[PDB]
Amino acid sequence: HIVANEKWRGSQLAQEMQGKIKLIFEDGLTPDFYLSNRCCILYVTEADLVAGNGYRKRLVRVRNSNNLKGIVVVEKTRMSEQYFPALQKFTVLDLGMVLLPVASQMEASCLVIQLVQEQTKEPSKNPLLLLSEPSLLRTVQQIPGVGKVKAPLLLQKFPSIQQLSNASIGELEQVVGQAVAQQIHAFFTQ
């Protein structure tokens, strides 16, 4: 159901996923998991938060790939806590990826499950994935000095904000007159 790295055979991660997601174990691949042919997961252990380069070059490789969209998941514990701000500066700010703190790899199980559910389910299934005339009247009402009654009368003679903008004081005199007519032309000019 999703492609994993041989590194993960028989592990706690895989044990908790086994039931809800089927796993295909592949050898040598750069990520730890592939969600799709355009998205993947890079897992970072508490262990290799030791100022070592065990994960860094893997993340950079994924960034170089023209289509591949990487999302990094990390074990955040009392010991690795101090090293997290630098990981986050590198991944999210320098590299432009997603970083996900996780306590146990038992927590990462639930996370990867819901991460797959999100990916497999149809587009616009998540809420985050039309001209209004009332707004246009509100916008014209913001030009001094016209209120709720003068606004629609202006739009009647000049059907758009464009036409209202290049409207002569003469033509404005007819519909509103005197100071109000000059007050609209003064707003648009300079």
């Binding site: 997290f84 986050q88 997603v98 991460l115 809420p127 707004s135 913001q142 904000i161 464009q162 290049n166």
Partner: protein, 198 residues
């Protein structure tokens, strides 16, 4: 690193005073408190940042309110970032919809660390030439603010960069995109707004 501008919502003076204070006094950047009715920090043209506590995010009764706020922000901003800050489990679904929507998420341990995060977001956006620097003052602002889906900073650099609201109204989609500092499709939307005939 310093001099860079940043917009802060008034509600943040009570909510995150140490953040604003650390931004100004430690990292020495030009912070401006503004009336941004629906958001916390404007860190560049195009990017808004939103801070929320780990308790708030775990309390999944403002789960749907939060999502609706992200939707409102999506209309006005090309890039959206949320900082989950530690305070002084079923919500993994919230995080995945955010990620899936291409919304960047940061994690902070304190208000001081959150300020460092905002500083660093500012520099990245400054390096990308989408930096915020502009006067942030002129009262044709309100007219630009009445246009739906227009961020406070968009409206701001519409007042600046356009000689007249008259010439703004007669500008081709190419130059409104560049002078208003907005997207290629966003320039078409406000064009259809100014040019809408009854």
């Amino acid at each position: 690193g310093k001099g860079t501008c940043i917009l802060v919502g008034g509600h943040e003076i009570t909510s995150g005073l140490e953040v604003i204070s650390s931004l100004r006094a430690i990292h020495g950047l030009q912070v401006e408190v503004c009336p941004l009715n629906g958001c916390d920090y404007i860190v560049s043209n195009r990017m808004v940042v939103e801070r929320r506590s780990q308790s708030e995010m775990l309390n999944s009764v403002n789960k749907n309110k939060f999502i609706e706020q992200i939707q409102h922000l999506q209309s006005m901003f090309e890039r959206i970032c949320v900082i989950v800050e530690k305070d002084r489990k079923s919500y993994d679904s919230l995080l995945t919809t955010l990620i899936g929507a291409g919304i960047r998420i940061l994690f902070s341990s304190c208000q001081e660390e959150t300020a460092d995060l905002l500083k660093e977001l500012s520099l990245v956006e400054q390096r990308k030439n989408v930096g915020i620097h502009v006067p942030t003052v002129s009262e044709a602002l309100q007219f630009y603010l009445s246009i739906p889906n227009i961020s406070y900073i968009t409206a701001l650099n519409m007042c600046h960069q356009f000689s007249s609201v008259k010439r703004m109204a007669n500008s081709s989609l190419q130059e409104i995109s560049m002078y208003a500092q907005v997207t290629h499709q966003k320039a078409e939307e406000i064009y259809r707004y100014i040019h809408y005939v009854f």
